[PDB]
């Protein structure tokens, strides 16, 4: 095709149309599928990002385990790249009210996908039974705050994998582990997080009871952002999204 914009410009345009008369323009399901088709095509070289290797030395507290390249954002969506060093994870977290789509650029990530049980989805979340104990033991305040959940999947993804999609009510919690070296992925979220307006990134831990196939029910506890987890910016080297 002549006169085609960069792939990342086209992804940004499509995300904007997806998330925000005659002839009728596409609706949301068509737009989301087109967005997924564009992400399926995206390669690290399309963003001028070369695959990284050999984060050879142990990671001191001075250095961020994960870095972030900002590409674009509107009120409707955010668009950027997360780059995980060898042996690091983005800990389990949610995306309140949000859709998400990500695409691995290089390396391998294990993505564990979960949900809190939602009575709007025909579930009946129970309270933690009193005789239920965990390792480490739960403070009584924590017992009241435990949420039943479901661990749906825990697969490994590479650049060959299709994009990974989440919705407000399905696969809305995920953890992302870098497997066998550094890894990176492009992430689209809609709407973007907004701490100032009560749309936060919440972290969770899965509790380990005292006394196995997926899906399986789990107990979840909201937890602060881990002391050793942070994610600082670095320059984005790819084609610029205009304006
Ligand atoms: Ni996420």
The full DSSP string for 27-96 is -HHHHHHHHHHHHHH--GGGGT--------S---TTS-SEEEEEEEE-SS-EEEEEEEPTT-EEEEE--T
7-233 folds as: Jelly Rolls (2.60.120)
Interval between CA 82 and ligand 1 midpoint (Å)? 10
**Helix or strand or coil: residue 12?**
helix
Return d(Cα 51, Cα 172) in angstroms, integer. Answer: 28
- Single out the residue of 240, 238, 235 nearest to residue 47, CA to CA: 238
The total of other beta-carbon atoms located within 10 Å of residue 63's CB is 13
Resolution of this entry in Å? 1.8
Are 87 and 55 spatial neighbours (Cβ–Cβ below 8 Å)? yes
| Backbone CA torsion sign across 193, 197, 203, 207 | negative
Closest CA to 185 of 104, 107, 112: 104
Question: How far is ligand 1, taken at its centre, from the CA of residue 173, in Å?
Answer: 7
Checking DSSP bridges between strand 66-73 and strand 231-233, what pairing results, if any? parallel
The two tokens of residue 130 are: 């009193």
- Report the separation in Å between the CA atom of 93 and the middle of ligand 1, taken as the mean of its atom positions: 6
Question: C-alpha angle 96/63/114, rounded to 5°?
Answer: 25
Which residues lie closer than 8 Å to 50 by C-beta, 6 or more apart?
44
DSSP 124: -
Contact 201, 187 (CB under 8 A): no
Distance CA 42, CA 186 (A): 9
Q: Say if residues 71 and 238 touch (Cβ distance below 8 Å).
A: yes
Distance between Cα 174 and ligand 1 center (Å): 6
Q: Which tokens belong to 26? A: 């596409």
- Say how many Å lie between the CA of residue 184 and the centre of ligand 1: 13
Phi-psi region of 76 (alpha: psi -120 to 50; beta: other; left: phi over 0): alpha
Task: Answer whether 176's CB lies under 8 Å from 89's CB.
Answer: yes
Q: 174 a known binding residue? A: yes
Q: Quick one: tokens of 41?
A: 């095509």
Q: Coil, strand or helix: which one is 19? A: helix
Element (H, E) at 184: strand 173-190
How many whole angstroms separate alpha carbon 237 and alpha carbon 211? 50
Classified as helix, coil or strand, 144 is helix
CA of 95 to the centre of ligand 1 (A): 6
Task: Give the integer Cα–Cα distance in Å for 116 and 218.
Answer: 9
DSSP 189-222: EESPPBGGGTB---EEEE--B---PSSEEEEEEE
Please, are residues 204 and 223 in contact by the beta-carbon 8 Å criterion?
Answer: yes
95 is in an annotated binding site: yes
Tell me which residue of 13, 46, 54, 44 sits closest to 31, measured CA to CA: 13
């Amino acid at each position: 095709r002549d006169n085609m914009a960069s792939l990342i410009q086209r992804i940004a345009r499509q995300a904007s149309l997806t998330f925000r008369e005659a002839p009728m323009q596409p609706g949301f399901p068509e737009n989301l599928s087109k967005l997924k088709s564009l992400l399926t095509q995206l390669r690290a070289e399309d963003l001028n990002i070369a695959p990284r290797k050999a984060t050879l030395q142990p990671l001191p507290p001075n250095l961020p385990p994960v870095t972030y390249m900002h590409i674009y954002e509107t009120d409707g969506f955010s668009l950027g790249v997360f780059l995980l060093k060898s042996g690091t994870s983005i800990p389990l977290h949610d995306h309140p009210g949000m859709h998400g789509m990500l695409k691995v650029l290089y390396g391998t990530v294990r993505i564990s996908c979960m949900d809190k049980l939602d009575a709007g989805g025909g579930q009946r979340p129970r309270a933690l039974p009193p005789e239920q104990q965990f390792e480490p033991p739960l403070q009584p305040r924590e017992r009241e705050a435990v949420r039943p959940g479901v661990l749906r999947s825990r697969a490994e993804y590479t650049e060959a994998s299709g994009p990974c999609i989440l919705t407000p009510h399905r696969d809305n919690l995920h953890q992302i582990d870098a497997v066998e070296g550094p890894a990176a992925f492009l992430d689209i979220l809609a709407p973007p997080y907004d701490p100032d307006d009560g749309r936060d990134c919440h972290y969770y831990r899965v509790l380990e009871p005292v006394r196995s196939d997926l899906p399986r029910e789990v107990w979840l506890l909201e937890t602060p952002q881990a002391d050793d987890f942070w994610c600082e910016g670095e320059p984005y080297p790819g084609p610029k999204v205009f304006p």
